[PDB]
């Protein structure tokens, strides 16, 4: 069965927004927009300006793959815990989100070669309020748990959509001064738009396969060719020599 | 459903039964079929009935039913 | 079809008493489950619960009773 | 002060099942926004459930008649504080449908 | 049996992020980015630049053997608890996982020489929020906890897979200002990059 | 309608005994809140407050007298 | 016309016998429910609540000893 | 005529026993609130609140006491 | 409209015993800011504030205290 | 399967309401046996300790009580 | 959804009505430690760090109480 | 092959109606033995420990109601 | 809004045929290293 | 070998959650006996002695809620 | 060897479940007679006699649960 | 029975990395590292060096 | 809304209609634009067959 | 399944069987 993910977005924040107050003579005071008088007297009218931009765009496509027998259950379940390097080495701190994704199966076969299949599966990550800061959610990515129960007949070495999903998600807002923010002179000076879209599909395909034949190389010829290669192998001490040649050749 | 409906609507009742408005001696016994003895089960995942009986009541209750299960029509509110 | 005694019309009259109280026992529970801390939700659902205690054991002792009236009288039959 | 708002959200879920057989989905994303601040740092986050649970079968000229029992919506949140956070992230209602069609 | 992990990632950081504030004659006061002026009032904008990148790359290879009769249960399991080097004897401190692994089986003989077993098999470490430090998660890689549960038959001699699992995942963002980001003399000065790639296969 | 029994209406009499009693708390707390320092507003949340600790008490207690007052009864049937 | 047996009038004694139980344990609730927090009020009403259980007890337990009178005779009748 | 068991007269007796403890609380508080700095007023508002503390906790566990009395003979009648 | 319980009245009964006093604070603090070196206006502010210091000590105990005798009243319930 | 009866169900609904509650708490504890001196770490412990402790006694006593609902039941069957 | 419980969301709503006290106590420290000798840096972190004293003290006081509520109303299930 | 007549199979229908009950049993007792002050482990063998009592209940009680229905048959043969 | 419709026919072209395009494609394919080449093409094409 | 529960997991987390404050404590004490009058010696001991005191609070008082979490659930076994 | 009933290996599942918990109550116990004022002694005996206080509970209502799961069970064999 | 372990293992640590901040005439802050301004305004950068 | 149709012989319709409308009766919003700002309507209840 | 949907049809009802629509003494 295969999981894919592709996510899309992008984000735009720009313009300002006044307030304060000024005093006359301790005769008249004037305050725009929520400006508390009794907190300042003199204090002068502030702005708060924004501006910045960003885009985001992610991809995951994990397999897991196993097999059973015919008309008996099969259950596989993982999760694995994924950390990011959180930029400090004294002033130190972690983060971490686990992935979890469990199939389970209980298949037939039929009599024009079809295989059917009864799946169960769900998916995704646990609930975590972390990852304070700002590219800490953008370094690891988040999907929706999921829960499928479906019977589906397929035949043999073809593939079958099993159930996805998509989404488009749109926004736009213009935030301005009544009066002067329509001038075409410093008009310009008073707006406040942030736009806002999204984009996001996530799909299960699957596909199975008939499997009769032992596998060619053996498994301990691909290790060998793991730890030759790795770095790693430990057949050559002379101490370590006897215990491994007297459980590997039999 | 139907499975319900007559199967209690032939409760007890050694009768035979005539005819839905909505060779003697052996035409006569299979006429002396009883209403009680119609035994029907569901089978939900071919949207099917399973009926058992003589030569005529399977062909009888063939005719309730071909009048039993309409077209329902939708309707919309607002 | 479920046969229906006079015993199954009895409990019938509890199930039946009660509009949706099966509704609403799983449905404070639901409501409490996503959130087991709230007073205005404990409160409501101490006295949910207490009436479903007092459904099954009313429910129950009457059947109990009834059962034991009915069984001296035909013990009185030969 | 003046501001005009419009949003737009388009989702689907598909799926496939077999006749007379019942078939169940649900899910729930959780969705981020920056909020403007990385020393001054927070942030605010809702969710999107959707679920659906069907019961299909046929018919004789070729009509197909599904069952739909639907949820979908967040969860009623007291959060996103600021202004544009809420302009961030938009809501919608919880609902329910329970409907037999073909 | 055969526990084979391989390990692959890289990761790299780079760019900045302005705010701050501006004060105009105790009469204007420009704020860059949330910075209230009720908490200051001559502190001028500041910048905030990352600069980092790392690969990082893990393998573990494990088997356990053992025989049995025909029909007959086995068990075996196993717990190691690993350390690892926290750096400092006196300012001093350490952080350690365990590893728990589980296999029971049921074996049986058939006619043409294939052997048939009844298999259930786990293996990992459990979800630990510990190892504080940046390189201690590097110094003790992770696997995930698994299960299966299957019935198979194998001639005799040879090897079959069981279950497996691979993944790949990619992530890129830029961040930016937008007027000021996109001139062409020092537009790169303005940029917030971070791409992200990480590939892992794990198979029994 | 959700239904409701006699072990409702008594916890239902506490709920509207009281008008906005748990609204008010959660007014006096928000306004609390935001400036956790002002004797006008701790004197105001030690009232509510308590006022509430006291409503939810006298409710749970008087559901859980009838509990064993019904259980009693019923018990005495058999 | 409303039939009364003995057992009915056994129990009917401790309600004429009490006289307005009914009425003065629902006043009291409604006085506690205005202002739950008045100790003359929980007072009052504790001795009110507390009546009224030692009533429904002690009313119960005399009609279960008279059913349990009759039906050892009943039994050896016949 | 207002109707009172053996708990309500227990209890009855605790508020004639004290003359106008419900008159002596109220008076010394509403001289204490007109002018709450004078330490005549105070010295004679602690003591007569915590007598009135200690008169409802003698109060309320005189009457829970004879309760526990009758509970425990009721269910040794049948 | 505000519901109010029985320590509302309490608190409420602080609130009318004094006529003005948490307008006077207010006033003192506005004195003071103009000109904070006037030993006429230290000496005001000296006495206004210990006042509103034991006024706040003085209805937080009593507050207190009342729940605690309620909740020892309410616990004897069952 | 392994087989899980209703009152395992009951208890599942508590186990599945919160999400990684078991993780939350042994999260906070970790960033606070580090430096237990912080009060962000200790009041942000104090509201997740006080949560998980409403959450057992939550789910052992609502067992508790189908336990003691069925048992009265399984005594009514013979 | 990050699960949060009605005792964290009393906790949280001190978490959500400040902004960023959790920062402004921080900063001020760093001045302080920087120059332990100008009287405006002192008379500022002595009003943040008693409202920051009264801040945990009204959070912990008020989460213990929904406890022992939350507790009461639990044993009284069964 | 074990004999077993119908009453052996009303109770293999407990036997069989439950998949692991007795192995669950055995090894949630050894999983709290080791460790037997876990809320975690607790909770999820109070649950266990509670659902092997009402097993046994329902299936003792069940087999000795068939017996007495027997019993009153075969004293009608002669 | 609903919309039904039958489905019949096996998927073309296949998956795998398509998440070879997709990964290629994104950059994350690790079918180059050769150290990890060997288990991949183990378990992939039988 | 010597045994630990879990009881003793969550006190040996706080002695392993620190390093070695129990050093860190009899390190900054003779210290201060040496020469007592040094104020780099005695602000660090405050802070330390502070830390460490705080430390067997906040260990006791959880100990002591994870046995009441436990006793509440034992109680309801029987 | 020791006969062992079935109540007996359920409580000898307690004694080996520790290794030497009987051992390490009696030697914290006596390394803190010698001094009883050294905190590291008296955490370490409170968290020890907090395993003590739940082993014995744990084993004693768990052996009486299963007695009187087989009480119900002999009974109803004649 | 004969119970029988071997164990062998080797591990190295070597390299720096580098942060701090400097600051600009109170008019600019540049932060390498997540060096908050807000703690240090003439503290320049640091370094750490393991072999 | 929660209904049960029916159909007639003439072309009517009947259905069993209840419906419930309103927000909870939530006093908030305190300043005094804001309760303008989003209006409030009572709750309600219907319980009736109609055709 | 199968196995329950014409066992419990044929529960009881000793009767032999006709023809599905969807020697001579000794036969």
């Known amino acids: 069965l295969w999981i894919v993910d592709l996510n899309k977005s992008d984000l735009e924040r720009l313009g300002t927004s006044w307030s304060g107050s000024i005093t006359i003579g301790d005769k008249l005071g004037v305050s725009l927009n929520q400006s508390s008088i009794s907190t300042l007297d003199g204090s002068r009218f502030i702005a708060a300006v924004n501006a910045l931009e960003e885009k985001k765009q992610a991809t995951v496509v994990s397999r897991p793959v196993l097999l059973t027998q015919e008309n008996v259950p099969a259950i596989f379940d993982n999760n694995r815990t994924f950390y990011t390097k959180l930029i400090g080495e004294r002033n130190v701190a972690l983060e971490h989100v686990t992935y979890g994704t469990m199939i389970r199966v209980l298949p037939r076969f039929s009599a024009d070669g079809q295989i059917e299949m009864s799946l169960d599966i769900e998916d995704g990550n646990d609930k975590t309020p972390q990852s304070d800061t700002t590219t800490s959610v953008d370094a690891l990515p988040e999907v929706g748990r999921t829960l499928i129960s479906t019977i589906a007949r397929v035949p043999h070495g073809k593939s079958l959509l099993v159930g996805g999903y998509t989404r488009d998600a749109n926004t736009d807002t213009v935030q301005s001064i009544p009066f002067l923010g329509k001038l075409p002179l410093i008009g310009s000076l008073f707006r406040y738009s942030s736009k806002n879209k999204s984009n996001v599909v996530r799909v299960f395909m699957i596909e199975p396969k008939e499997i009769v034949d032992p596998l060619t190389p053996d498994a301990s010829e691909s290790v060998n060719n793991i730890l030759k290669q790795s770095g790693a192998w430990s057949g050559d001490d002379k101490l370590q020599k006897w215990v491994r040649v007297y459980l590997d050749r039999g | ?78 | 079809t479920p046969w229906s005694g006079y015993l199954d019309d009895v409990s019938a009259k509890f199930d039946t008493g009660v509009d949706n109280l099966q509704t609403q026992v799983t449905e404070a529970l639901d409501k409490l489950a996503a959130k087991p801390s709230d007073p205005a939700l404990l409160a409501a659902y101490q006295s949910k619960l207490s009436e479903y205690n007092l459904y099954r054991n009313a429910q129950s002792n009457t059947v109990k009773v009834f059962k034991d009236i009915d069984a001296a009288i035909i013990q009185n039959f030969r």
């Open chain 2, 1 to 78: 459903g139907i499975a319900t409906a007559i199967e209690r609507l032939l409760q007890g009742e050694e009768q035979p039964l005539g005819n839905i408005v909505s060779m003697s001696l052996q035409e006569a016994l299979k006429q002396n079929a009883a209403a009680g003895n119609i035994k029907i089960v569901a089978y939900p995942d071919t949207n099917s009935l399973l009926v058992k009986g003589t030569a005529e009541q399977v062909h009888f209750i063939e005719m309730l039913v071909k009048a039993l299960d309409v077209a329902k029509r939708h309707v919309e509110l607002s």
